[PDB]
Design a protein around this ligand. Structure first.
Ligand SMILES: *[C@@H]1O[C@H](CO)[C@@H](O)[C@H](O)[C@H]1NC(C)=O
Ligand SMILES: [Co+2]
Ligand SMILES: [Co+2]
Length: 434
């Protein structure tokens, strides 16, 4: 797809800290851009929509190639249309924003320049950030994660995509998402099937796969961290159900691991560590600091800071595993106790280390779940299981919670705020910001 300018594109600025082993940190200046799927897609020479509701223009988009040639992505009014704002080192995303039409959440990427994404090499380093999840009820997910996307959004590999990172193109993750309207410089109209429960989305014949590090997926009730390996480290297109993931019949028939080696303290037994109020170790009604360290062994460590008090990820005992470090033993013990073989089939942490050794793009989003109502994160899942089933209970939310239309109607003012991002060698982000 090309880019149109009927609406200007001004990326909200966002600063972050780059720290060094020497003990100092220096301020960096970037910005955020919203993913192409949230944008208006119209004819290059008119205001005629190429996509509207959840169906494509049969005339402008008779096939994927013709569609990309006739269509363009336009600019975004970040605050008024998408409820996205920034102030210094802070980023806020509102859940439902009402303008000429209704918008739900957003998916944003941190940029290095107005035309390129910022790439981070996680291995050997740590990522720290502050988050306020107090306004996120059951069914919502304020997420901060990394994916192995190209810095240019795919332009160099696919010339038919001239919009690029400036317009949020090139997304990919461990779900091999098929809901993307444009993949590899081509539209995804071929094989497109409108969503039965979402008037604005659908699933196409193509998907976009790549490694994914979910540093943070949470709301005021539950939180989870999870590395997701793929047999192909970087962005790669997939065909239909061969894609695997939540958008296909068989989520395990692809090149990526859709489940990941997830670590949810509540799911592991510590139901007093994270929640609203003083009865929990971490009070989710207040801002908290989350630090994630990627040691060269490939294992992942985590600690939190709130009100000046530091807490390592809580210890967990699963099978023969005991500790608080997310390593091979934990992931293997998890599949043995909770079930599944997706993470290990895709190479586990060894394969994932190939992703963190390379560059990954920072993603920050706010979303509700039209496929599973976010039950996998904050409730009992599958809903027919009980606490007698190992790992079934992940949070205290009702198995009836998270219906998109309901949470959108009841909690439109929900929001998430990410701030004070700091990146650098392990042991360096706690030092004074520059
Ligand atoms: C939960 O984790 C916190 C922090 O490590 C710890 O202080 C507390 O004793 C743990 N409680 C349970 C039930 O595991
Ligand atoms: Co194809
Ligand atoms: Co270690």
């Amino acid at each position: 797809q090309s880019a149109c300018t009927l609406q200007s594109e001004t990326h909200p600025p966002l600063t972050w800290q780059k720290c060094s082993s020497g003990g100092t940190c220096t301020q960096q200046t970037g910005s955020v851009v919203i993913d192409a799927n949230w944008r208006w897609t119209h004819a290059t020479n008119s205001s005629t929509n190429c996509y509207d509701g959840n169906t494509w223009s049969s005339t402008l988009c008779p096939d994927n190639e013709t569609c990309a040639k006739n269509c363009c992505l336009d600019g975004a009014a970040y605050a008024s249309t998408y409820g996205v704002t920034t102030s210094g080192n802070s980023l806020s995303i509102d859940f439902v924003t009402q303008s000429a039409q209704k918008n739900v959440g957003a998916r944003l990427y941190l940029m290095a320049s107005d035309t390129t994404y910022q790439e981070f090499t996680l291995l050997g380093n740590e990522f720290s950030f502050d988050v306020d999840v107090s306004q996120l009820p059951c069914g919502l997910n304020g997420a901060l994660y990394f994916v192995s996307m190209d810095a240019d959004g795919g332009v160099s590999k696919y010339p038919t995509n001239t919009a690029g990172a400036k317009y949020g193109t090139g997304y990919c993750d461990s779900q091999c998402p098929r809901d993307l309207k444009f993949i590899n410089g081509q539209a995804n109209v071929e094989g497109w099937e409108p969503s039965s429960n979402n008037a604005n989305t659908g699933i196409g014949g193509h998907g976009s796969c790549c490694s994914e590090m979910d540093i943070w997926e949470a709301n005021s009730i539950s939180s989870h961290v999870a590395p997701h390996p793929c047999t192909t480290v970087g962005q790669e297109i997939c065909e239909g159900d061969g894609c695997g993931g939540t958008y296909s019949d068989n989520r395990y028939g692809g090149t990526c691991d859709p489940d990941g080696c997830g670590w949810n303290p509540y799911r592991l037994g510590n139901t007093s560590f994270y929640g609203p109020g003083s009865s929990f170790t971490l009070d989710t009604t207040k801002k908290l600091t989350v630090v994630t360290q990627f040691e060269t062994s490939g294992a992942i460590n985590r600690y939190y800071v709130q009100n000046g008090v530091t807490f390592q990820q809580p210890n967990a005992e699963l099978g023969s595993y005991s500790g608080n470090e997310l390593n091979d033993d934990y992931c293997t013990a998890e599949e043995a106790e909770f079930g599944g073989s997706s993470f290990s089939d895709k190479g586990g942490l060894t394969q994932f280390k190939k992703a963190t050794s390379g560059g990954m793009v920072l993603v920050m989003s706010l979303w509700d779940d039209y496929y599973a109502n976010m039950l996998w994160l904050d409730s009992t899942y599958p809903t027919n299981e009980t606490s007698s089933t190992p790992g079934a209970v992940r949070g205290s939310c009702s198995t009836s919670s998270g219906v998109p239309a309901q949470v959108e109607s009841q909690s439109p003012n929900a929001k998430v705020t990410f701030s004070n991002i700091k990146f650098g060698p392990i042991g360096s982000t706690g030092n004074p910001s520059g």
